[PDB]
Design a protein around this ligand. Structure first.
Ligand SMILES: *[C@@](O)(c1nc2c(F)cccc2s1)[C@H](C[C@@H]1CCNC1=O)NC(=O)[C@@H]1[C@@H]2[C@H](CN1C(=O)[C@@H](NC(=O)C(F)(F)F)C(C)(C)C)C2(C)C
Ligand SMILES: *[C@@](O)(c1nc2c(F)cccc2s1)[C@H](C[C@@H]1CCNC1=O)NC(=O)[C@@H]1[C@@H]2[C@H](CN1C(=O)[C@@H](NC(=O)C(F)(F)F)C(C)(C)C)C2(C)C
Lengths: 306, 306
């Protein structure tokens, strides 16, 4: 028992991190097989960042201008191209620690671990959600760019995020590994703000199931509700609509605890209308929405990797 | 900017995890050089656990009775001894992935990462505090025993915790790596409960500094206080006394933000007496006490390892 914000083991991803330098800009890169992936703004100076023309800056560079280091070792670059907001540097050495991997684009509400890095070295790991407004609530400093987010399935690392920038209110924005941004952000120092965020309703419900599994059951009431009535209430508290797919995805947890999803929905509705009245759930005073149904199952059933 | 519960990168520790089986009991072990460390209760049956005589169970075993596996590979045991509540199995193969390491015993209030494992494989990693009452607030299931907690300093892994048991209220208890328990717990299924816990005052103060660093400054008042007056108030809200050593340890953060420790103490005193009045600090509705001063600095200044 116990329930924590748990990150995936970071080892397989630690073995892929390198430092990429172009002039006086240094940031992190991800070395898979014989390719290094990093943010394209590695090619920018201080003066380039209001409105850079990346294609123009890139044509002016050749292979040798890119200093890639893996620990003590410099990797010789032998090719370079740009894909969306990412740069791919072909190198002459395949990374022997490359794990089985894929590139995926996640959906809003999905969680992943971030391996925060500086100078190609790891600072730490933490779990995050892709927010409905396409930001993440990260912890990133200058030099964190090229840090990645990922999920693990048995032996396979799915890379879903590469870090690029910080937006107003200290939230974060970045790309998939093909260099396409999550949300309408661009990689230039210009005025940009995330839209209003919302609560990821299905995740709140998954965490309420986790609470029942851990014996924290005071908020369960004796009612049910329809999906329609529930969704009218949720909408007023800035909660995402719950879809039938969300209901289906909650099925394992429902089946395990014996509590129908629509009954849990009646219990959440009461929480939203009445507040928690100074009580906690799993040690928390606020409803948490950064655990997915799958995150709850893996934690509570002891799913392992590697 | 941003502030998260960040765990150390787990790779160096992932490379040391193995599975130890003795009869039908399987749990996790830590393979450093040519020695495997695991909880001694690996030698127990179901019927042994109310009141086991470990020394008696152990004399009945020989080397070959211990099945140690590292992935696909079985490690041949060539010696065994017991140290306090830990078993040391000498094996014929040195772990080539052994990092530089030490065994340390931490003090109450200190944080560390836990690499939760089942069958010698990692489930996830999370940050924890050794509580004043010598429990940790973990997330552990059956089979998690032998999971370890650690800190990293540059390249050196300091192992401070090995997991043994779960106590009432779903908190956790375990040993240092010489097999001595934190707190007055014993490794037998008998009635045991942790004493009343308290809040780790110095950590709450470190997290308040983190909030100011991140621009969350609404709770700062215009007063100071003496250490004595502060400690009388803290005592009533079940906060640990703040010592002069705690004040000294907070010095970097104080110096960075420009806020004297005793002024931050005046601000915390107001929080304890008046509550937070429905506001959050760094997204939290409760005061957090599982970040140390060092955890705050490393996160906010981007300290890396490996
Ligand atoms: C990233 O680590 C790095 N970016 C550069 C760089 F452009 C040149 C040299 C070295 C580095 S490292 C960095 C991560 C940020 C810094 C603070 N927290 C982070 O997450 N990214 C940026 O600095 C980034 C790059 C230029 C401006 N950037 C921003 O993050 C800015 N944000 C925006 O302008 C906004 F998002 F639009 F709001 C900033 C600096 C926070 C104001 C570019 C987007 C290319
Ligand atoms: C641990 O993973 C394992 N212990 C055994 C074992 F003894 C025999 C075979 C296999 C395993 S695996 C396990 C971790 C626990 C289980 C639930 N959450 C955890 O953190 N430890 C125990 O089961 C442990 C061992 C016997 C009884 N144990 C307890 O944790 C019990 N607690 C207590 O009796 C109390 F702490 F005193 F309260 C239990 C099972 C939670 C009631 C012993 C202490 C040797």
């Amino acid at each position: 028992s116990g329930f924590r914000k748990m990150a995936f083991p970071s080892g397989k991803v630690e073995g892929c991190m390198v430092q990429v330098t172009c002039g006086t800009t240094t940031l992190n890169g991800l070395w898979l097989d014989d390719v290094v992936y990093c943010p394209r703004h590695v090619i920018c100076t201080s003066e380039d960042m209001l409105n850079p023309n990346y294609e123009d800056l890139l044509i002016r560079k050749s292979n040798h201008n890119f200093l890639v280091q893996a620990g003590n070792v410099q990797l010789r670059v032998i090719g370079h191209s740009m894909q969306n907001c990412v740069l791919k540097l072909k190198v002459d050495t395949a990374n022997p620690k490359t794990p089985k991997y894929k590139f995926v684009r996640i959906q809003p509400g999905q969680t992943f671990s971030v391996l925060a890095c500086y100078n190609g070295s790891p600072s730490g790991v933490y779990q995050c959600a892709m927010r409905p407004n396409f930001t993440i609530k990260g912890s990133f400093l200058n030099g964190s760019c090229g840090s990645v987010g990922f999920n693990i399935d048995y032996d396979c690392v799915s890379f879903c995020y590469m870090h690029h920038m910080e937006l107003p209110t200290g939230v974060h924005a970045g790309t998939d590994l093909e260099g396409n941004f999550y949300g309408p952000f661009v990689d230039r120092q210009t005025a940009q703000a995330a839209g209003t965020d919302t609560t990821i309703t299905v995740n709140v419900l998954a965490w309420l199931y986790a609470a029942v599994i851990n014996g924290d059951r005071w908020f369960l009431n004796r009612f049910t509700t329809t999906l329609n009535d529930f969704n009218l209430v949720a909408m007023k508290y800035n909660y995402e609509p719950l879809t039938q797919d969300h209901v289906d995805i909650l099925g394992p947890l429902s089946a395990q605890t014996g509590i129908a999803v629509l009954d849990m929905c009646a219990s959440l509705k009461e929480l939203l209308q009445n507040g928690m009245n100074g009580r906690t759930i799993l040690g928390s005073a606020l409803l948490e929405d950064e655990f997915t149904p799958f995150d709850v199952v893996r934690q509570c059933s002891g799913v392992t990797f590697q």
